[PDB]
Every structure is written in structure tokens, then in C-alpha cells.
Design an enzyme around this catalytic site. Structure first.
Site, mmCIF file in Angstrom:
data_model
loop_
_atom_site.group_PDB
_atom_site.id
_atom_site.type_symbol
_atom_site.label_atom_id
_atom_site.label_comp_id
_atom_site.label_asym_id
_atom_site.label_seq_id
_atom_site.Cartn_x
_atom_site.Cartn_y
_atom_site.Cartn_z
ATOM 1 N N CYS A 47 45.859 -38.978 51.983
ATOM 2 C CA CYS A 47 46.555 -40.181 52.687
ATOM 3 C C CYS A 47 46.271 -41.647 51.815
ATOM 4 C CB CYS A 47 46.246 -40.565 54.177
ATOM 5 S SG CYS A 47 44.241 -41.114 54.488
ATOM 6 N N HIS A 58 40.779 -45.574 55.989
ATOM 7 C CA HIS A 58 42.304 -45.810 55.546
ATOM 8 C C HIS A 58 42.227 -46.652 54.542
ATOM 9 C CE1 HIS A 58 46.303 -46.552 56.459
ATOM 10 N NE2 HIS A 58 46.220 -47.863 56.979
ATOM 11 N N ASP A 76 50.709 -52.330 53.400
ATOM 12 C CA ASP A 76 50.450 -51.215 53.844
ATOM 13 C C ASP A 76 51.311 -49.961 53.962
ATOM 14 O OD1 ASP A 76 49.379 -48.872 55.261
ATOM 15 O OD2 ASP A 76 48.182 -50.014 56.491
#
Lengths: 620, 4
Positions: free
Chosen positions: A252, A297, A320
Site C-alpha cells: 500500500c 498508512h 492521499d
């Protein structure tokens, strides 16, 4: 008299432009420069050289498929001595035998991109226009007038020029640092970045305007955040760099890695950042097993002014690129000023979570979000912790008043409403109060399990999930869950206990409400009737009964009575036939009142499906 | 990357 000029060639001064403009790696073959800063072209003429008294030269530049002067994507400007600062200009800075060295400057707010540069040469009474060549124009962190200006050289080196770094991962307690090759200046990469812009939805919708809006790093950062992820069109849907990914796409943490590559390439100072979260038989966790919470994250921050917002928001902007999001000023996140464009609540929810208990109103610290926010140190192989830029110290006045600005009183307890008995079906309620002026949309998980006297949890015996429960201002609700005998009968512990748990999630601010309550399923009461009169003399009859509470019949039914001062011998009575659901079983036994005062009769009822039920009665 |  004088014959028109013939250009022999144009020297794009790649070596000198590249170094001065911090684009040397990009200027191996074609000219790449940055806005708001002079650059150089050398004209060689075949025959006579330029003569200002006779020759008038005019330049034209265009970018994109629908250029206009009003949109800033087309300009025309004469070669002259007067240099108007902030405009497209050209001036002579050197004149030798057959050569003419020009200095050109672009506005510091010029749209970025690929320009075609043309020249019109005019010797009164006659003229001839033609294409000189092309150059790519990039954002300029070295130019004080440019929106992406950064006042520190070492920062400009790190956040624009440096082609490798670290993306942090692992966990808050074991932070790991993946080394990564952004490779923003590798062969083909810049062209790929320009293409990505050229196929973004806003280009398709209005190409001229998109190309014009590329003067803004706000606009360009926004477009890139959106383009990294294949909605489709996008780039992404092991490796150690971004280059390969971008090359294949043309034909990710990775999402942030690619955004950083593209943004650095275009000249926007950018860095990858990592947020860590941590957890500590909890409904919350059970909930998580499309707004998941992860151990970590990643996103990016880019550096720019924000003329589109009120003053004070220049600097780092969160973007983001995770499956358009941003740019939002990091400081607006820290201040809970969540009306600030773009997408502030989403970034705020990445670094905040408010978790409150009603395990009967206390703070729950089993979920912890926004720890050890990390990014690579300037010019050194180490980690910088930037947690402070996103959140005030826990417990401070500034933290609390930011919480307030972010939220502009919700409460939840578990309720039953009436008697609860072994064998009966009954509702349980998540009673939710909303004494605020706000309207909320929440997820609700409400569910029940058996639980032992030791606190161990049995199997589930009821669940209600609601994706979208609405709460009007100054209102309340009792949301029911039906507990069925049929579902709990088989899975009960030694106790008659069931644990009800509820979880309310308001996913925009990222708030969590838990409520929890143990329930006891009462045994049937044993009724004991005293027949006669409490005579210190003698002879008394006691009647005992029990109404079957189950929806099913009881087998092997036996009372047992005893009580010193009342009976001399215990008496067990086997009931012959089974007792039907709701049927009231009844026996009688004779007593011989020992002495004078109070005595207590003590009864036990036993059954195949219902055991250990007790009762007592005082007498005299 | 792992869900909490």
C-alpha cells in the site's frame, strides 16, 4: 536594402540551462527549465547578424491543444532591452560575429508543461515566422516568486532533487525503513508525468482550462492524487522503485511512492509520510475483521502557498493517493479546522480516533491512532518524527479546542425494558441519545453472547448490523435486537448470563461509542403456600409450585423440601408425567411445627432441562 | 500493510 535574416540554428544551451535550473539530468537531449528564472538560447544566423536598428524579432510560445493568451497558455513577446519583471520576455545578453545570445524569462505563475517556441523575424516591409523548438517548463522551488518556493537549499535538494529515500513501515514499536528509488529524473519519466496529466478527467472535460490550471501546484497536486489510483485511467490497482511501475503503465505504500515520484519530477517539493496505528475480546477489533484501520498508512505532503484559502495556510499540504484526496494544509488538520479544502475530514480521520466507553462514561484506549508519524530527515539517512505537525500533545488546551472546532454530546447505553426470564424471548436495546444540534450517520453493531461467571464469552446468540443509522438533532432511539430462547438455549454457560455489546461508529470524524451490559436470565420463582395456621401446637401443610417458563416441556421433575423446625424428615417427590410449557406443577407435604418462633422452609426443584432452582418461605 |  537589408535582406531578411536566415537562421542557421538555435543552440538550446542544455549544459548551462540544466545546471542553473536544477534540471541537468533532464536536459540530456531536450530543454527542461523552471519558471520565473532566466534561461538562454543562442541564435546562429546564416549571413549577416541581427541589427536592432533594422530587425524586429518577436517570440511566440504555446502549450496544449487549445492555447489562448487569456488562459496564459499562449504568449507573444518582442526581443527588446526593457525587461518587464513577471512577464514573458526576451533580451539580448551577448552579440558576437555570427551569434546572438538571448535571455528569456517566464512568469513565476506560468502553467507548467511542454511549450513550442516560435520566432518571427521582421526586416521592415517583410517578415518570416518559424519554429525554433520546444522546452518543458517546470515548477521552481528556487524562485521566491513561485508558489512552491522553499527558502532552504538543503530542503530543495531533499524534496525535489534527491532520487532515493525511505518509506517507513512495520509498526509504531518496530518501525522499518524500506529504501526506495523514486527515480524522478530517469529516462522517459518526465514525459510519462506529462501524459498522466494529459489523460486526467479534467483534461478530457476541458483541455484548454486544464492546461491553464497547471499554473497551480494546488491543482496539479490534486490531479495527481487522483490519477495514481485506477478508478479507470489510473496507474495502480516486491519492487524497490517507481520507475518500472510508471514505464509499464505508459505501455500500500506504493501509492505514496508513485505520487512522490511524479510530484518531485514536476518540481513540487514532496515527501512520503507514514502514520502508525495500534490496538490493545473487543467489539472494535471484531468490527474490523470501506474504511478499515491498518497498522500503518502512507501518504504524501507537498509544499506550496495557498492563495485559494485564507492567510496562514502556506506550507505542507497532505495529499492521499490511496484507493482525488487533498491537498489539505497539515495545519488545518492539527487545528481541526475541517471546512478547509480539500477533503480535510478524511485526512483528520487518518490521524484521529475518539473512543468512548459505557461499560456499565470513560475513555477507551484500546484503539490508538496517529502515532510516530514519520518521514526521512533532510540530507541524512534517518527518520524524522512529525507527529507534532498533525496533533497537539494529548491533554493540552490546544488539543481540546481543536477537538471542539472539529466537532462543532452523543451517548449510548444498553436497556431491556422489562423482566427477563430463562426460557422467554425478549428484546434488548441500544438506547442512543443525541443532544447536539448536529445530524449523524453511523454504523451500528449490536450483538449478544453467553458469558460465564468467570467472564469467558460463549457463542453468539443475536446480531444486528446497520450500515447507516441516522440520528437527528436533539433526538433519541432505542434500537432493538431480539434474543431468542431457541438461539441461546443450546449455548448457555453455568450462569444464566448473556453479554450485550453495542458499537456506534461515526466514520467522518472517526468516533467510536461502545456500550456493554451483562444480563441475568431469572429462574422461575418457587411459590410456597402455607396451609393452616402457625400453631405452636401441631399439624401444617405446605404447597409448592413452579410454572414452567420454557416453551418446551420438562422431564424428570422432582421437588425436594426441608427445614429444621418444620419437617423432621426431608421429603423428595418425583413428578410422574412431564410438565408442559407454561404448565404449573404442584405438590403438597405435611409439616409438624417443632417449636415457637420463625422457621424457614427450603426448596429445590430439579429437572432434565431446568436445574438448581431454589426457593424459601418464612413461617410464624 | 495489515488490518488492525
Amino acid at each position: 536594402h537589408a535582406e531578411e535574416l536566415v537562421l542557421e540554428r538555435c543552440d538550446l544551451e542544455l549544459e548551462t540551462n540544466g545546471r542553473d535550473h536544477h534540471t541537468a539530468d533532464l536536459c540530456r537531449e531536450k530543454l527542461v527549465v523552471r519558471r520565473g528564472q532566466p534561461f538562454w538560447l543562442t541564435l546562429h544566423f546564416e549571413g549577416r547578424n541581427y541589427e536592432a536598428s533594422v530587425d524586429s524579432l518577436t517570440f511566440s510560445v504555446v502549450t496544449g491543444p487549445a492555447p489562448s493568451q487569456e488562459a496564459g497558455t499562449k504568449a507573444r513577446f518582442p526581443l527588446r532591452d526593457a525587461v518587464e519583471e513577471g512577464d514573458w520576455t526576451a533580451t539580448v545578453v551577448d552579440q558576437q560575429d555570427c551569434t546572438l545570445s538571448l535571455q528569456l524569462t517566464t512568469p513565476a505563475n506560468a502553467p507548467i508543461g511542454l511549450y513550442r517556441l516560435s520566432l518571427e523575424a521582421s526586416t521592415g516591409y517583410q517578415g518570416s515566422s518559424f519554429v525554433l523548438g520546444h522546452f518543458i517548463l517546470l515548477f521552481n522551488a528556487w524562485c521566491p516568486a513561485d508558489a512552491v518556493y522553499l527558502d532552504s537549499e538543503e530542503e530543495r535538494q531533499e524534496y525535489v532533487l534527491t532520487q532515493q529515500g525511505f518509506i517507513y513501515q512495520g509498526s509504531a514499536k518496530f518501525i522499518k525503513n524500506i529504501p526506495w528509488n523514486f527515480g524522478q529524473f530517469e529516462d522517459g519519466i518526465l514525459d510519462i508525468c506529462l501524459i498522466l496529466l494529459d489523460v486526467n478527467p479534467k483534461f478530457l472535460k476541458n483541455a484548454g482550462r486544464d492546461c491553464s490550471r497547471r499554473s497551480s501546484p494546488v491543482y496539479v497536486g490534486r490531479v495527481v492524487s487522483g490519477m495514481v489510483n485506477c478508478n479507470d485511467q489510473g496507474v495502480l490497482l516486491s519492487w524497490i522503485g517507481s520507475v518500472d511501475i510508471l514505464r509499464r503503465w505508459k505501455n500500500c505504500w506504493v501509492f505514496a511512492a508513485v505520487a512522490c515520484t511524479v510530484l518531485r519530477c514536476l518540481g513540487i517539493p514532496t515527501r512520503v509520510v507514514t502514520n502508525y496505528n495500534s490496538a490493545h475480546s473487543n467489539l472494535l477489533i471484531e468490527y474490523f475483521r470501506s474504511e478499515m484501520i491498518w497498522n500503518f498508512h502512507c501518504w504524501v505532503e507537498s509544499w506550496m502557498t495557498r492563495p485559494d484559502l485564507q492567510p496562514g495556510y502556506e506550507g505542507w499540504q497532505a495529499l492521499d493517493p490511496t484507493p482525488c484526496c487533498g491537498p489539505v494544509p497539515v495545519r488545518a488538520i492539527k487545528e481541526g479546522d475541517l471546512s478547509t479544502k480539500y477533503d480535510a475530514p478524511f485526512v483528520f480521520a487518518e490521524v484521529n480516533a475518539d473512543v468512548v466507553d459505557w461499560i456499565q462514561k470513560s475513555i477507551n484506549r484500546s484503539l490508538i491512532v496517529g502515532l510516530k508519524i514519520s518521514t526521512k530527515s533532510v540530507g541524512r539517512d534517518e527518520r524524522e518524527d512529525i507527529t507534532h505537525t498533525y496533533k497537539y500533545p494529548e491533554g493540552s488546551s490546544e488539543e481540546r479546542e481543536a477537538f471542539t472546532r472539529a466537532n462543532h454530546g452523543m451517548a449510548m447505553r444498553i436497556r431491556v425494558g422489562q423482566s427477563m426470564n430463562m426460557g422467554s424471548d425478549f428484546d434488548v436495546f441500544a438506547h442512543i441519545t443525541n443532544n447536539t444540534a448536529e445530524e449523524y450517520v453511523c454504523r451500528l453493531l449490536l450483538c449478544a453472547r453467553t458469558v460465564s461467571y468467570n467472564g469467558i464469552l460463549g457463542p453468539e446468540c443475536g446480531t444486528k448490523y446497520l450500515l447507516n443509522l441516522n440520528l437527528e438533532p436533539f433526538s433519541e432511539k432505542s434500537v432493538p435486537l431480539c434474543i431468542l430462547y431457541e438461539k441461546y438455549r443450546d449455548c448457555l454457560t453455568e450462569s444464566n448470563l448473556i453479554k450485550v455489546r453495542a458499537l456506534l461508529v461515526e466514520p467522518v470524524i472517526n468516533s467510536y461509542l461502545l456500550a456493554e451490559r451483562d444480563l441475568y436470565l431469572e429462574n422461575p420463582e418457587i411459590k410456597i403456600r402455607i396451609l393452616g395456621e402457625p400453631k405452636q401446637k401441631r399439624k401444617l401443610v405446605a404447597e409448592v409450585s413452579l410454572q414452567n417458563p420454557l416453551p418446551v416441556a420438562l422431564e424428570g421433575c422432582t421437588f425436594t423440601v426441608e427445614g429444621a423446625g418444620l419437617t423432621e424428615e426431608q421429603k423428595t417427590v418425583e413428578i410422574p408425567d412431564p410438565v408442559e410449557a407454561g404448565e404449573e406443577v404442584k405438590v403438597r407435604m405435611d409439616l409438624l411445627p417443632l417449636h415457637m418462633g420463625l422457621h424457614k422452609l427450603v426448596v429445590n426443584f430439579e429437572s432434565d432441562k431446568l436445574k438448581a432452582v431454589k426457593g424459601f418461605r418464612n413461617v410464624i | 500493510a495489515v488490518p488492525l
